[PDB]
Each structure stands twice: as C-alpha cells, then as structure tokens.
Design an enzyme around this catalytic site. Sequence first.
Site, PDB file in Angstrom:
ATOM      1  N   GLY A  31      23.628  40.403  -8.630  1.00  0.00           N
ATOM      2  CA  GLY A  31      24.678  41.401  -8.642  1.00  0.00           C
ATOM      3  C   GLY A  31      26.057  40.805  -8.457  1.00  0.00           C
ATOM      4  O   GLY A  31      26.537  40.068  -9.309  1.00  0.00           O
ATOM      5  N   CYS A  32      26.699  41.150  -7.344  1.00  0.00           N
ATOM      6  CA  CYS A  32      28.035  40.636  -7.016  1.00  0.00           C
ATOM      7  C   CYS A  32      27.935  39.215  -6.430  1.00  0.00           C
ATOM      8  O   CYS A  32      27.520  39.027  -5.289  1.00  0.00           O
ATOM      9  CB  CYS A  32      28.719  41.585  -6.036  1.00  0.00           C
ATOM     10  SG  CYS A  32      28.475  43.333  -6.468  1.00  0.00           S
ATOM     11  N   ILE A  33      28.273  38.225  -7.249  1.00  0.00           N
ATOM     12  CA  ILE A  33      28.072  36.828  -6.916  1.00  0.00           C
ATOM     13  C   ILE A  33      29.339  36.043  -7.276  1.00  0.00           C
ATOM     14  O   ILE A  33      29.751  36.029  -8.432  1.00  0.00           O
ATOM     15  CB  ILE A  33      26.858  36.263  -7.655  1.00  0.00           C
ATOM     16  CG1 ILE A  33      25.626  37.146  -7.391  1.00  0.00           C
ATOM     17  CG2 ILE A  33      26.584  34.828  -7.219  1.00  0.00           C
ATOM     18  CD1 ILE A  33      24.339  36.559  -7.892  1.00  0.00           C
ATOM     19  N   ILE A  63      30.542  34.689 -11.145  1.00  0.00           N
ATOM     20  CA  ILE A  63      29.791  33.938 -12.133  1.00  0.00           C
ATOM     21  C   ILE A  63      29.356  34.866 -13.256  1.00  0.00           C
ATOM     22  O   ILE A  63      29.093  36.042 -13.023  1.00  0.00           O
ATOM     23  CB  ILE A  63      28.537  33.290 -11.534  1.00  0.00           C
ATOM     24  CG1 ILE A  63      27.514  34.360 -11.170  1.00  0.00           C
ATOM     25  CG2 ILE A  63      28.888  32.447 -10.323  1.00  0.00           C
ATOM     26  CD1 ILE A  63      26.083  33.881 -11.239  1.00  0.00           C
ATOM     27  N   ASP A 120       7.125  37.182  -8.650  1.00  0.00           N
ATOM     28  CA  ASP A 120       7.975  37.450  -9.824  1.00  0.00           C
ATOM     29  C   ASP A 120       8.519  36.199 -10.504  1.00  0.00           C
ATOM     30  O   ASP A 120       9.634  36.192 -10.991  1.00  0.00           O
ATOM     31  CB  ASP A 120       9.116  38.424  -9.476  1.00  0.00           C
ATOM     32  CG  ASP A 120       9.550  39.283 -10.671  1.00  0.00           C
ATOM     33  OD1 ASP A 120       8.918  39.295 -11.746  1.00  0.00           O
ATOM     34  OD2 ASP A 120      10.560  39.978 -10.558  1.00  0.00           O
ATOM     35  N   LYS A 173      26.788  35.616  -2.447  1.00  0.00           N
ATOM     36  CA  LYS A 173      26.274  36.923  -2.830  1.00  0.00           C
ATOM     37  C   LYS A 173      26.754  37.930  -1.816  1.00  0.00           C
ATOM     38  O   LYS A 173      26.643  37.697  -0.631  1.00  0.00           O
ATOM     39  CB  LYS A 173      24.737  36.923  -2.835  1.00  0.00           C
ATOM     40  CG  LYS A 173      24.159  35.849  -3.735  1.00  0.00           C
ATOM     41  CD  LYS A 173      22.637  35.781  -3.725  1.00  0.00           C
ATOM     42  CE  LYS A 173      21.995  37.047  -4.243  1.00  0.00           C
ATOM     43  NZ  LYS A 173      20.569  36.805  -4.642  1.00  0.00           N
TER      44      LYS A 173
HETATM   45 CL   LIG Z   1       7.155  37.675 -13.123  1.00  0.00          CL
END
Ligand SMILES: [Cl-]
EC number: 2.7.11.1
Length: 317
Positions: free
Chosen positions: A25-27, A24, A153, A47
């Site tokens: 990291g390594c995905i 589409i 996050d 993934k």
């Molecule tokens: Cl955030």
Amino acid sequence: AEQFAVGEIITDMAAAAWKVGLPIGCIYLADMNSSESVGSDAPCVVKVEPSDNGPLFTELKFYQRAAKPEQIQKWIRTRKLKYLGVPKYWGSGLHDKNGKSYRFMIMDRFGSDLQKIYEANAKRFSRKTVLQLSLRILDILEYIHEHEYVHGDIKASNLLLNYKNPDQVYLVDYGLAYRYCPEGVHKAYAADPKRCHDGTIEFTSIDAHNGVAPSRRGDLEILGYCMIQWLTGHLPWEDNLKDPKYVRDSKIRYRENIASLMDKCFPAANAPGEIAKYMETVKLLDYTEKPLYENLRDILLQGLKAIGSKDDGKLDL
Ligand SMILES: [Cl-]
Ligand SMILES: [Cl-]
Ligand SMILES: [Cl-]
Ligand SMILES: [Cl-]
Ligand SMILES: [Cl-]
C-alpha cells in the site's frame, strides 16, 4: 492524505532516526537520518497504515519476532548459507497526522518482483532458474517454519530481487502470515476463526481449500504449484479459478495421482523427475509433521545434476 511530509525525519520506538523519501500500500523510500535527501537508491522502505490496520500489525509482529538483523545473520552463518531471503526489520513506531493515528515500519528495499520478470520472459523460467529459486525458497520456508510461522501465499509477485544483487531472492508480505506453532504447540486440524485468508486460489493448499488453518505442508505444496507454473506457463485448473470447488477437486485428484499431473502439465512424456519426486514427498507429510527440508533440497539438487549444473547460486534471470 499524505501521511508524511517528504524529506521529514521520523524517529522509531528505539529512537533510531530515519528520513522519508518518495513513494515506490503506502510505501515510501527511506534511509538513515542525514543532511542528504533520500534518493532513488535508498536501502530501506517505510510502510505506513492506519493503526487499526490488522495486516500491518500481523506483519510487524512477524518481523519483530523472526526478522531481527542479528537473528538472520546468526542463522546464515550457522547454517553455512550464502544469504537468507527473509527481509530485515529496521524499526517501527506510531505516527499521528491530521487527527489520525498511524503505524509505520522500516524494512529492506528491493528491486523487481519475479512476476514482472516472468511475464517479460513470455511466462517461462528455465529449469535452472526454477531449481535455483526453489532451493532458496526452501531455505526461507525452513527458517520461518522454525520460528513458528507459515506464509500461506508464496508466488512470483511476493518474490523480490535484492536491489544490489539479481541472484538473491526474498519472500515478502507477512500481513496474512500465520502463527501455526505458538510457543511450540501446533495448531490442531481445524479452522482458525481469527483467520479470513485462503491464499491465492490457483496456488493455495488443499488444506486451505478445506477451510483449515495453514501449516508447513501447505507451504511446500504452494511452492510445488509455483514450480509447475514457472516451468510450463500453466496450471491445469487455471481456466476455472472463479469456482473454488473445481480448483480443490482438481488439486485433490492430482495429489492422489502425481503421474497424471506430470502427464497433464508436461504433455508428450518428458516430465522433470525432481518435480514429481518433490510432490510425492510433500504428499507424505501429515498436517502437524516437520518436513525434512534438506531431503527436499537434495531432490532439487538431483535436478541440477541431471541438467549438467550445480547449486552455484546463479538464478539466471
Ligand atoms: Cl500463493
Ligand atoms: Cl532465533
Ligand atoms: Cl496450522
Ligand atoms: Cl506439515
Ligand atoms: Cl502459452
């Protein structure tokens, strides 16, 4: 180092078969095994990371524990929700290629991230959009918090649209998520020496700035800062991101006086009251305290009333 041969069939640990498509990291795009090649409308991704990658192990554990398809559907039906923006876990296993050991995990595929849409919209999201997004994020945070995890996050780059429905937003990336409540016992107010992450500087919590493990109040505070960013294009401290000390200082002083945050972020009076109210309620939370999620949603719902709207699920993007 291509971890898969394109179009190959891989079998996860429950012996479910999948076919691997393009990146589409390594995905990689992914789908159920069939005589068809995996296409650009594939419903999953795979993934893949080295088996000693910490973040993928952490994320995989989150997904196994909290994102089982039946588990999420059960919650959606019982809480009377339209959907739930936690991505579904489909399987995982171990793959050895070229003398190296790798771990893979199959999960939902999504459309665009919010950050690209936000930028294409001159860094602004309507009040309608912000309230609708945030109600759904509160459903997501309530869910993950009830299954012993905080995200730490939340941001527009970690918010993805359902590939087949632009009104459904999902929160992704649990590689540095944190298990704040293992077996129902809350972590104490303290640093966790297993944890190296402070979140994303402009959005992260005062707690994380202070070097303590993230908890639920932290997640709700992060969303506060996102809401202001989305509404205004800006956060007060965005010109001093290089100095964490400064960012924390501004965050602490603005928590102490929310009215001056509103005056700073919405110049010439006119701040939306639900945002101030939301921040005030989050301020009240102790480190270990369960939030009153429905009250937080209510506050946001008063905002929708004020604008002549309702919670009709329309993100308006
Ligand atoms: Cl955030
Ligand atoms: Cl459950
Ligand atoms: Cl914690
Ligand atoms: Cl809390
Ligand atoms: Cl601007």
